[PDB]
Design a protein around this nucleic acid. Structure first.
Length: 49
DNA sequence: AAAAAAAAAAAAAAAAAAAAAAAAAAAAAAAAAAAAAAAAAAAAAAAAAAAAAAAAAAAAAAAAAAAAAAAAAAAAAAAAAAAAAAAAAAAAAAAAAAAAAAAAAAAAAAAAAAAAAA
């Protein structure tokens, strides 16, 4: 939801993980940046999902 | 073959550390002035020594400041309670010599392989 609200569309330039993690922690998910970045990393990997 | 403990998966909680770059301070370790202390020379004020002397303890005795007695009154110091400072007694400890177990080099000799001769 945070990535969709920011505008990280599949046909647009990449945004840094720091910005997305900061937006998620600030707005929606108050549980520390390291876990959120680990979830983003696992979602991005081609051998996990 | 039963019990027990490690480890790994992924979203969660919470931490820790190494360097660069300049300018100032603070420890901490050195050369190097600078003065005590000590060994070994010559040198020179003090004790000795003697004769010669006269200044202060004895002695008479008055008298004038005195130390014990009496009294009143003020209140310093001593011993008993508590409450802090500061030092030996005893025990503990981190590196540190001693011992024991695993990694790397060593060649003796042979299995398997590669290569070529007639």
């Amino acid at each position: 939801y945070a990535m969709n609200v920011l505008g990280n569309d599949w046909n647009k330039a990449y945004k840094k993980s720091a910005r997305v993690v900061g937006d998620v922690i600030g707005k929606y998910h108050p549980h520390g940046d390291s876990a959120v970045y680990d979830t983003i990393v696992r979602m991005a990997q081609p051998f996990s999902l």
